[PDB]
Design a protein around this ligand. Structure first.
Ligand code: CHL
Ligand code: CHL
Ligand code: CLA
Ligand code: CLA
Ligand code: CLA
Ligand code: CLA
Ligand code: CLA
Ligand SMILES: CCCCCCCCCCCCCCCC(=O)OC[C@H](COP(=O)(O)OC[C@@H](O)CO)OC(=O)CCCCCCCCCCCCCCC
Ligand SMILES: CC(/C=C/C=C(C)/C=C/[C@@]12O[C@]1(C)C[C@@H](O)CC2(C)C)=C\C=C\C=C(C)\C=C\C=C(C)\C=C\[C@@]12O[C@]1(C)C[C@@H](O)CC2(C)C
Ligand SMILES: CC1=C[C@H](O)CC(C)(C)[C@H]1/C=C/C(C)=C/C=C/C(C)=C/C=C/C=C(C)/C=C/C=C(C)/C=C/C1=C(C)C[C@H](O)CC1(C)C
Ligand SMILES: CC1=C(C/C=C(\C)CCC[C@H](C)CCC[C@H](C)CCCC(C)C)C(=O)c2ccccc2C1=O
Ligand code: SF4
Lengths: 222, 42, 203, 742
């Protein structure tokens, strides 16, 4: 059990049974003595894995389109740095089949079904496989662990087929990857504010010229 | 539902509702028959 | 009990038990928490279900048929301002009387069930309905169609409320659309059909 | 340690208690015995201490209650921003702020009251405001009706946030006691988080928005063409065209070459000749300097890691020979009693409000605030009254602590003990001074008036006769005038313009400020203020010390905080409760403040304000008569009350009519209060009985038996009206007078 910047408070509750544990917690948050809302160690763990997963597909989409624009068969029109895809109009935009704010509400409705149902199973286990939902109820009950619902829709082939250690090994891989992605996305942002030439370019700027080291420069431009 | 109606029936809440209606009525009449110093109908 | 709920997996309020037609356990604020208001409100929702159903028929059907060339009906929005064979005021007054007659008798049945169903003039014209809000009788059931077994009326009445709820949204749809869009309801349909991703609330 | 343990769902959200009035108190809940019941319902509504006996619930209620108070303020702010956007000539005011009155209220024309819509100019009409928002919206570079609208929505949203927050933290997840009592972290966050990061963030908005934009308007441009504030923050070259230090970016800040930002971070001092306000560079620098000081101060008290102080140990080292045990034990009695903290906070926040009013008239911080005579007089008068009341409140709650929470068997303190033991000395000595000042402050006015009446104007106390020169104020004025020379070499000019040297600042034919002389006539009035302040201290201080016992009544504590009397025995014991000492203090607070805001109004019109000639000669509003006519009591009647009430009195038939009515209306309420103060209850109870009999005759006798007001309510209503009549009369007296003459 490797520990990183541990604390006496941390090792009272960070037992290591939770995957991704390294006993790093110096702000009293996951402390189980204080539990109102959103300070439950489960909920925080629930928010930990989900944020990582969103990062794990958020990161890749944050470097895929321009880098695939480096050699790939994507017509350069839809090959753009991530912040000018249309999310931030003052960085730029692109005219998709829609006009924006209809894409948003569409997206917020599609998400609404998955999200809210994803919430109820945390409140009431097995509830989301009870009321009629055009079939599919046989799967949407979940395996009892909200973060790891399982089922043929979520775990189609089935890994963690039968090994808890592997699953514990796997889930350890799932969080450390998750932490890696959260920091990484925080990297793609703060680079953008200072560099302002896009994420993957800013690695070349340090590739062709390691003596660039924009740290010492700290020039700001859009 | 019953408790809401009861609360709405306590004296101060009726007062503002009653007087407010009364204020609206008098203001309307003065908007339609202004200056009104005499009662010249009969 | 296990009937579908508006919010699946939630706990429906106790005073909603699925007996009434259209009871999907929806009452966050508990407006029908006490039985009496529920009884009145059941009527309130019921009649509102019928008026809008005509209003939806009143707005959409003519505007549809005038959008194509078959007729001449103007916009429902400015329908009131139009000048018909006499002044609007008296017709509204005439509307005040006659509706007040039915909205009078209906009122009596609500406050006291079953005391209004016999014709005041030709006493053999008695009405057949037993449930409050379902008058029955030959005037309002020219062939019956309401006098059946349960689990059928519950189906049928739910087929009456569930359509009515569909109307009340739609007419308020035609309401706000006419205000912040400059045209009729059908245009707001078509301009949404040419460029669905562009022509919306966000202009 | 320091953690966040809260509870889950203490009290269930329900409407039942909304239909059981007086549920909170066991006594009130039984029902309306008589009409005395419906007065005790409100008198004990908020007294959370009397409802329950443990600190945990009292805490959760005050914590949630504040959220309500916080929410209302946001709603109040939201209206002010909304009203300024939909019903104001703000955008017109941004063109000629010198000579267009700020108007942000428009009345519906029902009963002729559209005469109130005054010709405030700018192609608009409406009630001319005086709260001075317009100078605040210009100092922040608003320059649009749209931007005033969006903040109004933003202000409104937070009101829903706060109000929601209040609900959540009392019915859903209420904090525990251990959360509240951890007062080290409390201070630690407020110093660094609220106070510290509040300034730094604001010092941000001034650097990027208010400064470069207002530098356009001051340079002189129509408001419609000023590039929007997000253009500077995007197009960094625009900031270059004004401020070349913005080319290098934030790297000098990191290489300690701080003298590169000298263009927009300075130490000028003085006032801006163009706009008559402070230099926004200084203000920009000021919040930045404050930010660092607060933030570092935040990191003092130990919270969870090794570093930091212990507030308990700081109070337990200062103990002295004369004092004995020193500040030991004060940590408890300042932690397990809300009435201690409320009394201590009230005094400081009360005092600070006053210092705010002394600075905002001498170092005018917003542009075009100096030449706004309507605003200066109101803002100075407003915060004096607010400051006056809050100090009186600190006496009441200190008195309440002595009765309820104080206990010398557990929460024992030594200093608060020694102070009690020699209380006879404290009051008697403070009694002698209040007499000494009384004779030598008012008496000099009386002697002046007598000699003047007898035809001996060479025995009066004045600059032209026996002289009383304030030298100590005249000396300190001298020091601040020459401070820019030696003792503050950085400063270009003095910190103000009222120092006894320098030169005036003229803005649009209206004097901003000039050196305020201090002769004999000012010496007397400064010793009037020293008199009424002392007397007000005497009353409140006596109440606090003698709130538990005295040589008359040895068990006064057992009688509570606000009890009427102890009967007519022992000669008569009317008004011995600490509540009646604060009841008496209110008048003197009303007395001290009123002369202060009289002193300010006459001194500024006579010696400072007024138009300015093109040639350069200055003519003040009243012709500079303060130095001769303010030394005689009759002088304060002729040339201040009688001669400066002309505008209010003849304000009928023009937009200032509403002040003419309030002037009278406030007299009526003032004279009305006397019926309650002078008379007593036992007479009004009997007359009520005879009135009650007539209703028995016609069967209309109510079942909540009529009663006269309780003894301490007859006083409470008496003082309240008296204060309302007195303050409002001055209110209508001031605004109508100053608005017409400038
Ligand atoms: C008329 C009131 C009514 C309202 C305001 C809603 C709105 C809602 N329904 Mg609901 N329903 C309502 C009635 C009904 N629903 C349903 C059938 C469903 C299903 C199957 C689901 C919802 C879901 C939802 C929720 C998520 C919608 C969303 O993501 O927005 C954007 C939301 C509370 C979703 C949900 O609750 O997930 C937890 C969901 O899966 N509704 C039926 C037929 C049984 C209803 C009958 O009146
Ligand atoms: C139910 C009912 C509803 C929803 C309406 C709705 C309307 N009527 Mg109408 N009416 C209704 C019943 C009746 N109206 C009228 C007679 C009129 C007249 C004369 C007018 C309206 C007008 C209006 C419009 C007012 C615009 C508005 O509300 O601004 C938000 C609106 C479309 C006005 C209009 O057409 O403006 C465009 C108008 O001039 N109505 C009569 C008497 C026969 C009614 C009897 O029930
Ligand atoms: C006034 C300052 C203030 C303070 C000191 C706290 C303090 C706290 N809040 Mg809190 N809160 C506040 C304002 C504040 N809140 C506001 C304005 C909102 C509305 C957005 C919330 C919404 C909120 C939620 C939703 C939650 C907290 C929680 C918490 C706790 C962690 C802690 C006791 C969390 C907790 O554990 O519950 C107590 C929690 O779940 N608060
Ligand atoms: C949650 C993660 C996430 C999010 C929010 C986005 C968001 C976006 N992606 Mg994207 N992407 C992601 C992950 C993500 N990506 C990953 C993981 C990959 C690699 C498999 C890609 C590969 C990718 C390509 C190849 C393209 C986008 C494009 C886009 C933009 C249009 C939406 C789209 O894909 O059309 C849906 C596309 C379909 C083919 C259906 C939008 C900014 C387009 C664009 O212009 O890039 C900005 C585009 O052509 N994405
Ligand atoms: C933010 C500051 C603040 C806070 C939180 C309180 C809070 C409180 N004060 Mg207090 N007070 C304050 C400022 C404050 N006061 C000031 C500035 C003064 C000086 C004028 C006083 C003078 C004062 C007195 C003299 C008394 C209180 C009392 C009380 C308690 C009951 C209040 C009540 O039921 O009134 C309910 C609200 C009203 C009756 C509204 C009155 C309507 C006005 C007149 C208009 C309550 C704890 C009472 C107490 O604790 O007795 C044990 C009490 O006797 N206060
Ligand atoms: C105009 C009305 C008035 C006057 C003159 C006074 C005067 C006084 N009040 Mg007072 N008071 C008043 C209204 C007034 N009050 C009202 C309305 C209230 C209710 C709120 C109070 C409440 C109140 C309290 C609660 C207290 C006072 C106190 C005082 C005394 C302190 C001032 C002092 O020592 O000066 C000295 C006296 C004067 C300035 C009066 C004028 C004297 C001149 C200079 C000369 C007089 C003539 C001279 C003696 C020649 C004699 C001639 C010969 C023929 C006899 C003083 C006697 C305080 C006190 O006594 O403790 C110190 C105190 O605690 N009063
Ligand atoms: C005791 C009164 C007093 C006060 C309030 C200040 C106040 C200040 N001095 Mg200061 N100063 C004083 C006496 C005082 N000085 C004396 C007696 C000397 C000896 C000549 C100095 C020498 C001095 C220097 C050399 C400097 C200040 C500076 C400053 C400012 C920081 C601040 C305004 C600094 C300054 O200019 O701030 C901008 C600065 O550089 N002072
Ligand atoms: C002249 C009197 C000087 C008074 C003086 O300098 O006091 C100084 C004196 C110092 O007391 P100690 O040094 O013993 O107290 C140490 C403090 O840290 C508290 O323990 O304070 C007193 O004893 C109370 C005197 C108040 C007198 C108030 C008069 C108004
Ligand atoms: C939408 C509506 C009511 C909606 C009520 C809602 C959402 C309440 C929901 C909730 O309470 C519940 C359920 C449960 C609570 O716990 C939660 C909330 C959320 C609080 C009524 C519309 C009702 C709509 C009606 C009645 C429409 C009537 C139409 C009429 C009368 C005809 C009009 C015409 O004649 C004119 C005017 C002009 C002619 O040219 C044209 C025609 C059309 C012919
Ligand atoms: C633990 C602890 C404890 C102690 O006691 C104290 C402390 C230390 C403080 C703490 C710490 C904490 C932390 C650090 C945290 C972090 C987190 C994160 C970062 C997350 C992220 C997170 C993040 C995330 C999710 C992200 C995501 C993203 C995404 C999706 C993206 C998207 C996109 C794209 C693609 C493109 C387009 O065009 C645009 C967009 C739309 C934009
Ligand atoms: C006048 C006076 C009264 C009499 C005042 C009383 C009895 C209260 C004033 C009457 C109020 C206004 C009750 C009226 C309000 C009722 C709720 C009825 C409301 C109906 C209206 C809508 C018309 C006292 O009781 C008293 C007590 C102690 C010292 C001095 C005095 C004192 O001076
Ligand atoms: S007069 Fe009133 S206050 Fe004085 S003793 Fe009698 S009852 Fe008490």
């Amino acid at each position: 059990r490797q520990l990183w910047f541990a604390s006496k408070q941390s090792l009272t509750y960070l037992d290591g049974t939770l995957p991704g544990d390294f006993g790093f917690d110096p702000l009293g948050l996951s402390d189980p003595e204080g539990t109102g809302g959103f300070i439950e160690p489960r909920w925080l763990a629930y928010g930990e894995i989900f944020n990582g997963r969103t990062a794990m597909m958020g990161v890749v989409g944050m470097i895929a389109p321009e880098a695939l624009g480096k050699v790939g068969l994507v017509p350069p029109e839809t090959a753009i740095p991530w912040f000018q895809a249309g999310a931030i109009p003052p960085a730029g935009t692109y005219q998709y089949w829609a006009d924006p704010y209809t894409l948003f509400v569409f997206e917020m409705a599609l998400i609404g079904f998955a999200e809210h149902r994803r919430l109820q199973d945390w409140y009431n286990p097995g509830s989301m496989g009870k009321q009629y939902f055009l079939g599919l109820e046989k799967y949407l009950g979940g395996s009892g662990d909200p973060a790891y619902p399982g089922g043929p829709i979520f775990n189609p082939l089935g890994f963690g087929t039968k090994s808890e250690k592997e699953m514990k090994e796997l889930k350890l891989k799932e969080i450390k990857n998750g932490r890696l992605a959260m920091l990484a996305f925080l990297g793609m942002s703060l680079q953008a504010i200072f560099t302002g030439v896009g994420p993957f370019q800013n690695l070349l700027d340090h590739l062709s010229d390691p003596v660039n080291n924009n740290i010492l420069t700290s020039l700001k431009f859009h | 539902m019953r408790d809401i109606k009861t609360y709405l029936s306590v004296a101060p809440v009726l007062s503002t509702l009653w007087f407010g209606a009364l204020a609206g009525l008098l203001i309307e009449i003065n908007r339609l028959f202004p200056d009104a110093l005499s009662f010249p109908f009969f | 009990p296990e009937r579908p709920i508006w919010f699946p997996g939630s706990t429906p309020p106790p005073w909603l038990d699925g007996s009434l037609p259209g009871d999907f356990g929806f009452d966050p604020w508990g407006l029908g928490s006490d039985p009496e208001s529920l009884r009145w409100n059941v009527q309130a929702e019921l009649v509102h279900c019928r008026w809008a159903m005509l209003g939806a028929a009143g707005i959409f059907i003519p505007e549809l048929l005038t959008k194509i060339g078959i007729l001449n009906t103007p916009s429902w929005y400015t329908a009131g301002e139009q000048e018909y064979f006499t002044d609007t005021t008296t017709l509204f007054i005439v509307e005040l009387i006659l509706i007040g007659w039915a909205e009078g008798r209906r009122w009596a049945d609500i406050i006291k069930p079953g005391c209004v169903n016999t014709d005041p003039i030709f006493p053999n014209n008695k009405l057949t309905g037993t449930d409050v809000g379902y008058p029955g009788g030959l005037w309002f059931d020219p062939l019956g169609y309401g006098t059946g077994s349960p689990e059928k009326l519950k189906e049928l009445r739910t087929k009456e409320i569930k359509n009515g709820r569909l109307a009340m949204l739609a007419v308020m749809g035609a309401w706000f659309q006419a205000e912040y869009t400059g045209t009729g309801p059908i245009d707001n349909l078509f301009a949404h059909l040419a460029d669905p991703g562009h022509a919306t609330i966000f202009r | 340690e320091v953690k966040i343990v809260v509870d889950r769902d203490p009290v269930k959200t329900s409407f039942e208690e909304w239909a059981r009035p007086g549920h909170f108190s066991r006594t009130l809940a039984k029902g309306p015995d008589t009409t005395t019941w419906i007065w005790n319902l409100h008198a004990d509504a908020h007294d959370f201490d009397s409802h329950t006996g443990d600190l945990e619930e009292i805490s959760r209620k005050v914590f949630s209650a504040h959220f309500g108070q916080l929410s209302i303020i946001f709603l109040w702010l939201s209206g002010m921003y909304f009203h300024g956007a939909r019903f104001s000539n703000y955008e017109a005011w941004l063109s000629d702020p010198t000579h267009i009155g700020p108007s942000a209220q428009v009345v519906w024309p029902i009963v002729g009251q559209e005469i109130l819509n005054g010709d405030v100019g700018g192609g608009f009409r409406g009630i001319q405001i005086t709260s001075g928002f317009f100078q605040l919206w210009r100092a922040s570079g608003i320059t649009s009706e749209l931007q005033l609208y969006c903040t109004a929505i933003g202000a409104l949203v937070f009101a829903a946030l706060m109000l929601f927050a209040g609900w959540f933290h009392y019915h859903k997840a209420a904090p525990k006691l251990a959360w509240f009592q951890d007062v080290e972290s409390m201070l630690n966050h407020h110093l660094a988080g609220l106070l510290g990061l509040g300034s730094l963030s604001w010092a941000g908005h001034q650097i990027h928005v208010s400064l470069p934009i207002n530098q356009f308007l001051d340079a002189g441009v129509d408001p419609k063409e000023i590039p929007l504030p997000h253009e500077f923050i995007l197009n960094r070259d625009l900031l270059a065209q004004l401020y070349p230090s913005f080319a290098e970016g934030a790297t000098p800040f990191f290489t300690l070459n701080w003298s590169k930002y000298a263009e927009f971070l300075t130490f000028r001092g003085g006032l801006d000749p163009v706009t008559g306000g402070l230099w926004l560079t200084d203000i920009a620098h000021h919040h930045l300097a404050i930010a660092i000081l607060f933030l570092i101060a935040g990191h003092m008290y130990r919270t969870n890691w090794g570093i930091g102080h212990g507030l308990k140990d700081i109070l337990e080292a200062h103990k002295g020979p004369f004092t004995g045990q020193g500040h030991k034990g004060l940590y408890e009695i300042l932690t397990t009693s809300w009435h201690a903290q409320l009394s201590l906070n009230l005094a400081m926040l009360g005092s600070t409000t006053i210092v705010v009013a002394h600075h905002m008239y001498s170092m005018p911080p917003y542009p075009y605030l100096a030449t706004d005579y309507g605003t200066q007089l109101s803002l100075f008068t407003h915060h004096m009254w607010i400051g006056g009341f809050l100090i009186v409140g600190a006496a009441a709650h200190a008195a309440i602590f002595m009765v309820r929470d104080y206990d010398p068997t557990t929460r024992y303190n030594d200093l608060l003990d020694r102070v009690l033991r020699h209380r006879d000395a404290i009051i008697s000595h403070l009694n002698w001074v209040c007499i000494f000042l009384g004779f030598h402050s008012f008496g000099l006015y009386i002697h002046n008036d007598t000699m003047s009446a007898l035809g001996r104007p060479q025995d009066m106390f004045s600059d032209t006769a026996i002289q009383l020169q304030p030298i100590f104020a005249q000396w300190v004025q001298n020091i601040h005038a020459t401070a820019p020379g030696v003792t503050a070499p950085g400063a270009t000019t003095s910190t103000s313009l009222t120092w006894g040297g320098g030169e005036l600042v003229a803005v649009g034919g209206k004097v901003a400020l000039l050196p305020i002389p201090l002769g004999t006539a000012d010496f007397l009035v400064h010793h009037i203020h020293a008199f009424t302040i002392h007397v007000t201290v005497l009353i409140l201080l006596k109440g606090v010390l003698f709130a538990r016992s005295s040589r008359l009544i040895p068990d006064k504590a057992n009688l509570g905080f606000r009890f009427p009397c102890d009967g007519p025995g022992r000669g008569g014991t009317c008004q011995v409760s600490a509540w009646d000492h604060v009841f008496l203090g209110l008048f003197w607070m009303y007395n001290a403040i009123s002369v202060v805001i009289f002193h300010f109004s006459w001194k500024m019109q006579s010696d400072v304000w007024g138009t300015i000639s093109d040639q350069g000669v200055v003519t003040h509003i009243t012709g500079g008569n303060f130095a001769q006519s303010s030394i005689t009591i009759n002088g304060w009647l002729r040339d201040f009350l009688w001669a400066q009430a002309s505008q209010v009195i003849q304000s009928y038939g023009s937009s200032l009519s509403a002040y003419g009515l309030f002037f009278l209306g406030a007299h009526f309420v003032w004279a009305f209060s006397l019926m309650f103060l002078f008379s007593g209850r036992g007479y009004w109870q009997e007359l009520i009985e005879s009135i009650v009999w007539a209703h028995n005759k016609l069967k209309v006798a109510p079942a909540t038996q009529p009663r006269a007001l309780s003894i301490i309510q007859g006083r409470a209503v008496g003082v309240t009206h008296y204060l309302l009549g007195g303050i409002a009369t001055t209110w209508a007296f001031f605004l109508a007078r100053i608005i017409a003459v400038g």
